[PDB]
């Protein structure tokens, strides 16, 4: 996206916003027993590890929009995907505010711990002041919605997380844009029935994987994505590279389903505060707020359709099976397509597509080497039809080496075990032994391989 406006906060009647500058990340008890090189992302200009201007390296996410327009192919992609989603018969009416706050079927309750955004972050007001979870009373919230209204600036926080070592000195730390609670509630109100239907129906009709459980969903993917050709590739800066035309296209699908097609352009043309600067961006999807993962998935469905259409012009879209989780996508067609040919068609829209898993060349894929949500695919030993989701061993080793809270170590390690065992008993037994070499790991419950495997069979 492109920065259209940039102003000092004191010149437009706004205050400075103060965002956490120190990491909660700390070496854990397993730091010296597992290998790794990730460190907490730089969170401030004064970090001694920096070797670059911090504010410039963050604002490089925004480097212009390519000159392009709607075409017939994007248009047929819109009509095809729309007719597919109509199959679901989503209720276009808004949901009650009670359901937006405390949830309903397919819509998780609002997180009451994260920031409430502008203006509440400057007023000493948190979410639990607006919403009482004990009584389910939202009277304070309703007054704050009336008083402050909607379409408020997003606060851009810096994501406190582990990063590869080369991204530390280069000041390459991710930005998340926490929208106001006022606006998250508006988006849930308008689009809540769509969000619910997607979460409850991950697969090839929504074209979306949000709300899936990889443990059981992995077995279904080969059934859904039939056709001789399994395809996947990676995007460079997906969120930032999405031109305004893809929001018009998304607006058109929402309109075909009788949903508000306009609220969406507040994501496209967005307003922000970072520290002491107010700024506005045209293009790009704000990373980390209202319906982000679903809207990105829907947009990816449009892109993949139009890109295949641009590269090949006797295509049958009924046979182009797609599953997307935001920027991450896997798809199939009834016969072999050239992924390089399809990727090249992205350039004219301002999309940058490289081969999957940081590969050198665009090569053919099968389920033996394809990745989705960081995971590979491996047939079970006894039942070859059940597919293990395979989480990278390296990412588990780096994760275990750090904590944000030592008290919740039992939960942290158990989560890692549930990921790890899918890579096989040999790698899992090595994992267990290293954990039990220190006395803090001796104190934990570490599930045996056989109980994990038996528990998994029973989830199906």
Swiss-Prot record:
It is a peripheral membrane protein. Residues 1-460 are cytoplasmic. Signal peptide: none annotated. Replication or transcription is subject to high level of random mutations by the nucleotide analog ribavirin. Mg(2+) 2 binds at residues 234, 327. It catalyses: RNA(n) + a ribonucleoside 5'-triphosphate = RNA(n+1) + diphosphate. Mg(2+) 1 binds at residues 234, 327. Replicates the viral genomic RNA on the surface of intracellular membranes. May form linear arrays of subunits that propagate along a strong head-to-tail interaction called interface-I. Covalently attaches UMP to a tyrosine of VPg, which is used to prime RNA synthesis. The positive stranded RNA genome is first replicated at virus induced membranous vesicles, creating a dsRNA genomic replication form. This dsRNA is then used as template to synthesize positive stranded RNA genomes. ss(+)RNA genomes are either translated, replicated or encapsidated. This is RNA-directed RNA polymerase. The chain holds residues 1694 to 2153 of 2153 of the full protein.
